Amino acid sequence: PEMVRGQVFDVGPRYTNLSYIGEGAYGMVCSAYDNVNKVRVAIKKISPFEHQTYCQRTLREIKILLRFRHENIIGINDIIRAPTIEQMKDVYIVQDLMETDLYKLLKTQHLSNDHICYFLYQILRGLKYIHSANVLHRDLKPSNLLLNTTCDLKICDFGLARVADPDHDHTGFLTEYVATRWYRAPEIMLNSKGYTKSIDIWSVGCILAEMLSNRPIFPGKHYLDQLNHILGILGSPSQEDLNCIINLKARNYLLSLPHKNKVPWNRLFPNADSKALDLLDKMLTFNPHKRIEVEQALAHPYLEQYYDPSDEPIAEAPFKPKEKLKELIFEETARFQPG
Ligand SMILES: *CC(=O)NCc1ccc2[nH]ncc2c1
């Protein structure tokens, strides 16, 4: 069995010459030489079988990524596991190797307006497909946007994804949430379970802002601090947007705050393209019902050099305990077995 940094990374003999890349949720990520296809690949080790929630997210992603096929969405090329349920402890998911990700790139690189435009186009093109399948990604962030050496972009990590359920979106004030804080839409903290497509467009807005300055736009340090970062820039919500929040704890929290002025986008981002900032404003709209949808975002003047709905494909159809979840992970990975 191959090893890397003390741990077993047991993918051979097909995959050899391992090098460490980084960490997934349930294990290590390495690159390896694929001896059949004669290219280096990425492989992530998943050890999920002790926990309901680890199993849930592992299985959700596998089911989604096997059903999806899109240029801007990472695929699964192979899955490695032991031949029987009794012997299966780890699962390895093999995927196309990508040089970097947007989190790593933003730490080190100034992006040209032309790169910002191209990255944003590819994110939304991928998101059009995901949303067309009635699926919500629910954890869009720079580290979930893979880039190769020619700046092709692929969305990854479908562990938090859900089928959209707008009729069951409503909840109370300060309801706990799982997805990454800095990219959470204001409504998560107020009255939303994150079951509508508008959740993903807010995160894309945050990513666009972050591409403009290399700094997260709303770097909250804790649950409600995230909301006050957002209101600090957007300003106090209007009467009409406040009246949309029927829940009294949420509404009265907002009414309790002093007046805050909107900070103009062109003052936060003085070197940004004015069309980029018009689109940014529409993605970072407080009221999720007024927020731009993915297909409108693609049609925005900022992206007119790339926009081509005939080349922005949609999905063929809508998408629909731990002993049982291990069995389901086993069955779902059967197609990659010798046999
Ligand atoms: C978002 C995610 O899954 N990150 C881990 C990862 C997947 C695929 C991949 N290909 N090259 C590097 C990679 C990292």
UniProtKB/Swiss-Prot annotation:
<dbReference type="GO" id="GO:0005739">
    <property type="term" value="C:mitochondrion"/>
</dbReference>
<keyword id="KW-0131">Cell cycle</keyword>
<dbReference type="GO" id="GO:0005901">
    <property type="term" value="C:caveola"/>
</dbReference>
<feature type="domain" description="Protein kinase">
    <location>
        <begin position="15"/>
        <end position="303"/>
    </location>
</feature>
<dbReference type="GO" id="GO:0045596">
    <property type="term" value="P:negative regulation of cell differentiation"/>
</dbReference>
<dbReference type="GO" id="GO:0038127">
    <property type="term" value="P:ERBB signaling pathway"/>
</dbReference>
<dbReference type="GO" id="GO:0050853">
    <property type="term" value="P:B cell receptor signaling pathway"/>
</dbReference>
<dbReference type="GO" id="GO:0072584">
    <property type="term" value="P:caveolin-mediated endocytosis"/>
</dbReference>
<keyword id="KW-0804">Transcription</keyword>
<feature type="modified residue" description="Phosphoserine">
    <location>
        <position position="274"/>
    </location>
</feature>
<dbReference type="GO" id="GO:0005524">
    <property type="term" value="F:ATP binding"/>
</dbReference>
<dbReference type="GO" id="GO:0060324">
    <property type="term" value="P:face development"/>
</dbReference>
<comment type="similarity">
    <text>Belongs to the protein kinase superfamily. CMGC Ser/Thr protein kinase family. MAP kinase subfamily.</text>
</comment>
<feature type="DNA-binding region">
    <location>
        <begin position="249"/>
        <end position="267"/>
    </location>
</feature>
<keyword id="KW-0053">Apoptosis</keyword>
<feature type="modified residue" description="Phosphothreonine; by MAP2K1 and MAP2K2">
    <location>
        <position position="175"/>
    </location>
</feature>
<dbReference type="GO" id="GO:0033598">
    <property type="term" value="P:mammary gland epithelial cell proliferation"/>
</dbReference>
<keyword id="KW-0238">DNA-binding</keyword>
<keyword id="KW-0945">Host-virus interaction</keyword>
<dbReference type="InterPro" id="IPR011009">
    <property type="entry name" value="Kinase-like_dom_sf"/>
</dbReference>
<dbReference type="GO" id="GO:0007165">
    <property type="term" value="P:signal transduction"/>
</dbReference>
<dbReference type="GO" id="GO:0007173">
    <property type="term" value="P:epidermal growth factor receptor signaling pathway"/>
</dbReference>
<keyword id="KW-0225">Disease variant</keyword>
<dbReference type="GO" id="GO:0048538">
    <property type="term" value="P:thymus development"/>
</dbReference>
<dbReference type="GO" id="GO:0042473">
    <property type="term" value="P:outer ear morphogenesis"/>
</dbReference>
<keyword id="KW-0547">Nucleotide-binding</keyword>
<keyword id="KW-0418">Kinase</keyword>
<dbReference type="GO" id="GO:0005737">
    <property type="term" value="C:cytoplasm"/>
</dbReference>
<dbReference type="GO" id="GO:0010800">
    <property type="term" value="P:positive regulation of peptidyl-threonine phosphorylation"/>
</dbReference>
<dbReference type="InterPro" id="IPR003527">
    <property type="entry name" value="MAP_kinase_CS"/>
</dbReference>
<feature type="modified residue" description="Phosphotyrosine; by MAP2K1 and MAP2K2">
    <location>
        <position position="177"/>
    </location>
</feature>
<dbReference type="GO" id="GO:0042802">
    <property type="term" value="F:identical protein binding"/>
</dbReference>
<keyword id="KW-0206">Cytoskeleton</keyword>
<dbReference type="GO" id="GO:0003677">
    <property type="term" value="F:DNA binding"/>
</dbReference>
<feature type="modified residue" description="Phosphoserine">
    <location>
        <position position="238"/>
    </location>
</feature>
<dbReference type="GO" id="GO:0001784">
    <property type="term" value="F:phosphotyrosine residue binding"/>
</dbReference>
<dbReference type="GO" id="GO:0005856">
    <property type="term" value="C:cytoskeleton"/>
</dbReference>
<dbReference type="GO" id="GO:1904813">
    <property type="term" value="C:ficolin-1-rich granule lumen"/>
</dbReference>
<dbReference type="GO" id="GO:0045202">
    <property type="term" value="C:synapse"/>
</dbReference>
<keyword id="KW-0808">Transferase</keyword>
<dbReference type="GO" id="GO:0006468">
    <property type="term" value="P:protein phosphorylation"/>
</dbReference>
<keyword id="KW-0965">Cell junction</keyword>
